[PDB]
Design a protein around this nucleic acid. Structure first.
Ligand SMILES: [Mg+2]
Ligand SMILES: [Mg+2]
Ligand SMILES: [Mg+2]
Ligand SMILES: [Mg+2]
Ligand SMILES: [Mg+2]
Ligand SMILES: [Mg+2]
Ligand SMILES: [Mg+2]
Ligand SMILES: [Mg+2]
Ligand SMILES: [Mg+2]
Ligand SMILES: [Mg+2]
Ligand SMILES: [Mg+2]
Ligand SMILES: [Mg+2]
Ligand SMILES: [Mg+2]
Ligand SMILES: [Mg+2]
Ligand SMILES: [Mg+2]
Ligand SMILES: [Mg+2]
Ligand SMILES: [Mg+2]
Ligand SMILES: [Mg+2]
Ligand SMILES: [Mg+2]
Ligand SMILES: [Mg+2]
Ligand SMILES: [Mg+2]
Ligand SMILES: [Mg+2]
Ligand SMILES: [Mg+2]
Ligand SMILES: [Mg+2]
Ligand SMILES: [Mg+2]
Ligand SMILES: [Mg+2]
Ligand SMILES: [Mg+2]
Ligand SMILES: [Mg+2]
Ligand SMILES: [Mg+2]
Ligand SMILES: [Mg+2]
Ligand SMILES: [Mg+2]
Ligand SMILES: [Mg+2]
Ligand SMILES: [Mg+2]
Ligand SMILES: [Mg+2]
Ligand SMILES: [Mg+2]
Ligand SMILES: [Mg+2]
Ligand SMILES: [Mg+2]
Ligand SMILES: [Mg+2]
Ligand SMILES: [Mg+2]
Ligand SMILES: [Mg+2]
Ligand SMILES: [Mg+2]
Ligand SMILES: [Mg+2]
Ligand SMILES: [Mg+2]
Ligand SMILES: [Mg+2]
Ligand SMILES: [Mg+2]
Ligand SMILES: [Mg+2]
Ligand SMILES: [Mg+2]
Ligand SMILES: [Mg+2]
Ligand SMILES: [Mg+2]
Ligand SMILES: [Mg+2]
Ligand SMILES: [Mg+2]
Ligand SMILES: [Mg+2]
Ligand SMILES: [Mg+2]
Ligand SMILES: [Mg+2]
Ligand SMILES: [Mg+2]
Ligand SMILES: [Mg+2]
Ligand SMILES: [Mg+2]
Ligand SMILES: [Mg+2]
Ligand SMILES: [Mg+2]
Ligand SMILES: [Mg+2]
Ligand SMILES: [Mg+2]
Ligand SMILES: [Mg+2]
Ligand SMILES: [Mg+2]
Ligand SMILES: [Mg+2]
Ligand SMILES: [Mg+2]
Ligand SMILES: [Mg+2]
Ligand SMILES: [Mg+2]
Ligand SMILES: [Mg+2]
Ligand SMILES: [Mg+2]
Ligand SMILES: [Mg+2]
Ligand SMILES: [Mg+2]
Ligand SMILES: [Mg+2]
Ligand SMILES: [Mg+2]
Ligand SMILES: [Mg+2]
Lengths: 64, 96, 84, 52
RNA sequence: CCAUAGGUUAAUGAGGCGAACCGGGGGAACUGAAACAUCUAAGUACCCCGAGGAAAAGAAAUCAACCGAGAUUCCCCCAG
RNA sequence: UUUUGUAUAAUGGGUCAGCGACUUAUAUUCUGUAGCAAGGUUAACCGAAUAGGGGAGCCGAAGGGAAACCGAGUCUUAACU
RNA sequence: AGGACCGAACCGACUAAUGUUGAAAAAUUAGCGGAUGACUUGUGGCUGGGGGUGAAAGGCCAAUCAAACCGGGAGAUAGCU
RNA sequence: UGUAACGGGGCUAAACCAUGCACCGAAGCUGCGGCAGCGACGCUUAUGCGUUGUUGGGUAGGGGAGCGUUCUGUAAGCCUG
RNA sequence: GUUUAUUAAAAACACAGCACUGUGCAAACACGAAAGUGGACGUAUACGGUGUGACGCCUGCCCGGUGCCGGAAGGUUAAU
RNA sequence: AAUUCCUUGUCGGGUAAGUUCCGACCUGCACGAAUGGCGUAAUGAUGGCCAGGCUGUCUCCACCCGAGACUCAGUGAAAUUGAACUCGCUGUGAAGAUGCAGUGUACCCGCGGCAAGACGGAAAGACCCCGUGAACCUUUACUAUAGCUUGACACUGAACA
RNA sequence: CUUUAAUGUUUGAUGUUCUAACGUUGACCCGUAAUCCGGGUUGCGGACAGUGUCUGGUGGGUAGUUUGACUGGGGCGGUCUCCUCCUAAAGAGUAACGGAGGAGCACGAAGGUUGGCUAAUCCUGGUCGGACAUCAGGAGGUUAGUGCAAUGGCAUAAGCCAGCUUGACUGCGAGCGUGACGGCGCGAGCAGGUGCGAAAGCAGGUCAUAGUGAUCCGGUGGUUCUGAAUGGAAGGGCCAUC
């Protein structure tokens, strides 16, 4: 049978051109009045998944 | 994704975005695909007859990719700037 | 019967190591913005083309080689970037 | 944790707000500061409102 | 009181068995979740009822999208 | 065999003969190999039939963005050195 | 007269020894308790498993009981050997 | 438990200190012969052929190359009273 | 008298007796999806449950807690 | 004390001598009145103590009778078992050696006996720990629930105040 | 409009009686040769009760499960995150149920800037006045101070006064540090708009290092980004935030 996609990882990651995955940063959902604006400003943009944890992502997203 | 009992990355990380239903019915077109139609006119029904975009598609853009060597009337489709210049340079006629 | 069991230790704590020190030594070519020293106080001081951070971190404002030197009447240790 | 949190609403009509804290016991009077409004790109007086 | 219930005759039929498949009435737990209670397992196993050589469904108060298709069932895609 | 480590007085086996444990299916990735090559490939099914037909479809030659949308660029931003 | 007395049948099972791959998957030998009673026994019947029954020990329910047996779910699961 | 605190016999050096020359002593090294791996270089490669260095302990584990068994084709062939 | 058939026969269980409490009869209660049945072909001098355990002398203080019973003015409070 | 830790409490009795026993004291670690208190004749295959009789229980064993054991004939098991050409000592060493080192001693093979060792046999330790194992039991653990109970609507209506 | 007298119906509550539902494990008759059942006459009760759905309570009577780890064996005890010093062996880092201490905040000024200033303690003299208030001089020279623990810093003060103020700005960010990762940190400079200062310049919170909590789910404001026939809308997305 077909492999089933981990639907949480499909809602959390998007594949880029060269096969990497973009993701949203954490820590930007609440508790935001004590955080510096510099920190948040460096947390709004999407980041790439690191080389170490990219294998578990590919295992969870076999269908890209 | 099991990391021991540590919170895995796909659950540490937040969800984002939604899925556009209109993107499934949009398409992008090479300039090299313009010759594969017949009649020298390019519509949605012409591209679907040439098996290029698919049936459920209702919108299509033409993108500067590849190259065309023939005058082609484009009708009812969006065209990029470079595709407009390349079509009009190759003899095309973009209309609506 | 006999295992007079007991005790403890109010002294189990310690904090994490902050990885301070000198990141780039003398005669060592750096780019602008490169952290040279992380430190608590001004154990070192900023010379030419060297800025002092919020946490007394010494970073390079320009490119070139690191120069350690002792100046002033208080014999304080200054870090400067030679031009390159 | 007596220092409660509030928000500083723009008086420029925009719903823009900065969020911050205050001690409402010792400072009963409202906080009013002149802050930057990125929507209007001007410095405008913000006033204290409830964090809600 | 008529009546009706009831009784008796007579005629026709049924009854029970049997491998799977089918429709329906009820309906688990182990397990998995690295525990577990929502969830899963699974409308599964199992029990019961009924039928046929197949059954069931079935001839739009249906889809569609402003173009249109034209009962039901089955297969491949759509699409993990 | 398990172990830091066993002649170990740690486990297992009386011996012989026979059996006895990384498979299978479908998806997916990588490597090799072969075919075609900006194209490649068909499934069901038809067909008397391992042919041929069938290109429905799938992957690829474009990406960015949450998205509309733009498009070899795009997003961010009022705008980017 | 007696849930009276002594004591065989009958019912039971306090002690010791034997035996413990037994004669016997609980017995023999020598003693022991009750023995007209809340006795005992024959035949047939009834109560069914989270249920029965129990002068109550978690006792007994076919040499099996802190939840029988058999078949099935079922190749339960086993980060353990 | 039995000498039992040189391994023993035994030693007044066969002990200790100093100096020196010998010799023994390993699967170390050298010699002779053989196999294989990896690199050089050159040929005119049969893509491997001389020379050339160097390497060759090994669990878990990774990689490479093989033997043999049963069955199908080659095989109505070949061997076999 | 009874008991752990197969390591425990006892001070353990039971017992007559005592007390509390429920029960007015289609009884309480119990087995049963229910019908029904037992209680009981009995009717409070009866039946069920609980504790104690012949007999003799006795059984003292505490109702704050936890239960049960009785109350119904007020507060709170469900579906609707 | 079926309850008393300290405790063999202290005193007395009994005995040559008594951590037990009996009777007192009360300082009741931590009795106590129907999860009954204190007494109690009789009974008890009940627990503890004492005495008389009795005796191989013992001092301390001796002899005898029989059933086996032993020998012959006939039949004929079993558990166990890596292989055995299966000594002692001191030491070493997976830390308690038939098997190693050093040394001593020892002709080969049975039979009757004993049971010190073969960490002997039997039973994948029941103790202990562990397992994101199980089961049963408990409760003011959690979540449910049968059952009991409350009220609304329905089966369910008419009059009068 | 404030307060209702009449009449009637829409109607609830509380009684009052009734009978026709319903109940009868009361009597009698019949089916019947029958203590079941049904029908019939009738008596009593009577819209109560009792059953169905919903609903609140109770509910170990029953069922499914949970009941942490480290640990010089387990349990009991203690601990579990963050900061500072030592151990730590002169880069970083480095363990123990090793030795000692703290944090789970505060501040609308205790922030920014400009300008100015410089302590502790002791000595002498001096009304109340005293070991110790305030005052003057001298020694001293940071032995003080730093919002709080320790360490490192601090005179150009980062310490102390006053004036003006909101840079406790928004979008970005070369380049580095640190982590397995998630992530955390420093940051010149760029654009806009601002504050102080004559100006050069400084300011993207506090001398620094603790003062904290992922995701999901859900809430609030803004934004047409999306909007399942179409137009809206719901809902969702993004930004801010709880
Ligand atoms: Mg948010
Ligand atoms: Mg097509
Ligand atoms: Mg302990
Ligand atoms: Mg379970
Ligand atoms: Mg389950
Ligand atoms: Mg599970
Ligand atoms: Mg039909
Ligand atoms: Mg083994
Ligand atoms: Mg070991
Ligand atoms: Mg060895
Ligand atoms: Mg041995
Ligand atoms: Mg062995
Ligand atoms: Mg073992
Ligand atoms: Mg063995
Ligand atoms: Mg095999
Ligand atoms: Mg390939
Ligand atoms: Mg290829
Ligand atoms: Mg008698
Ligand atoms: Mg006998
Ligand atoms: Mg008798
Ligand atoms: Mg018990
Ligand atoms: Mg039995
Ligand atoms: Mg059972
Ligand atoms: Mg069970
Ligand atoms: Mg199963
Ligand atoms: Mg199995
Ligand atoms: Mg000796
Ligand atoms: Mg010499
Ligand atoms: Mg040699
Ligand atoms: Mg060699
Ligand atoms: Mg050689
Ligand atoms: Mg090798
Ligand atoms: Mg070698
Ligand atoms: Mg063959
Ligand atoms: Mg009995
Ligand atoms: Mg008996
Ligand atoms: Mg017994
Ligand atoms: Mg017995
Ligand atoms: Mg009855
Ligand atoms: Mg009793
Ligand atoms: Mg008593
Ligand atoms: Mg009393
Ligand atoms: Mg009380
Ligand atoms: Mg009370
Ligand atoms: Mg009450
Ligand atoms: Mg209330
Ligand atoms: Mg006591
Ligand atoms: Mg004692
Ligand atoms: Mg005495
Ligand atoms: Mg004695
Ligand atoms: Mg006494
Ligand atoms: Mg008592
Ligand atoms: Mg009492
Ligand atoms: Mg008796
Ligand atoms: Mg013989
Ligand atoms: Mg045998
Ligand atoms: Mg020996
Ligand atoms: Mg030894
Ligand atoms: Mg012998
Ligand atoms: Mg022996
Ligand atoms: Mg013997
Ligand atoms: Mg074991
Ligand atoms: Mg339970
Ligand atoms: Mg533990
Ligand atoms: Mg160091
Ligand atoms: Mg070092
Ligand atoms: Mg040292
Ligand atoms: Mg100043
Ligand atoms: Mg003075
Ligand atoms: Mg300051
Ligand atoms: Mg500070
Ligand atoms: Mg969650
Ligand atoms: Mg819109
Ligand atoms: Mg719409």
């Amino acid at each position: 049978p077909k492999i089933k996609t981990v639907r949480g990882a499909a809602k959390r990651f998007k594949k880029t051109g060269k096969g990497g995955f973009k993701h949203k940063h954490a820590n930007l959902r609440h508790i935001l009045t004590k955080k510096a604006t510099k920190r948040k400003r460096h947390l709004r943009p999407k980041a790439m998944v690191s080389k170490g944890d990219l294998g578990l992502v590919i295992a969870c997203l076999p269908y890209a | 994704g099991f990391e021991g009992g540590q919170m895995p990355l796909y659950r540490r990380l937040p969800k984002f975005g939604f899925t556009s239903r209109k993107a499934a019915i949009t398409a992008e077109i090479r300039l090299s695909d313009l010759a594969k139609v017949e009649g020298g006119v390019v519509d949605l029904n012409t591209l679907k007859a040439a098996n290029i975009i698919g049936i459920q598609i209702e919108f299509a853009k033409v993108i500067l990719a590849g190259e065309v060597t023939t005058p082609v009337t484009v009708r009812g489709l969006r065209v990029t700037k470079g595709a407009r210049a390349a079509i009009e340079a190759a003899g095309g006629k973009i209309e609506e | 019967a006999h295992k007079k069991a007991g005790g403890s230790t109010r002294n189990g704590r310690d904090s994490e190591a902050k990885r301070l020190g000198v990141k780039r030594f003398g005669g060592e070519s750096v780019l602008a913005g490169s952290i040279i020293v992380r430190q608590r106080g001004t154990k070192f001081h900023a010379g030419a083309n060297v800025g002092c951070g919020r946490d007394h971190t010494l970073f390079a404002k320009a490119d070139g080689k690191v120069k350690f030197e002792v100046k002033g009447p208080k014999n304080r240790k200054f870090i400067s970037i030679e031009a390159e | 944790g007596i220092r409660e949190k509030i928000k500083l609403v723009s008086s420029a009509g925009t719903g823009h707000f900065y969020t911050t804290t205050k001690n409402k016991r010792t400072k009963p009077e409202k906080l009013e500061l002149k802050k930057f409004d990125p929507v209007v790109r001007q410095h405008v007086i913000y006033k204290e409102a409830k964090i809600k």
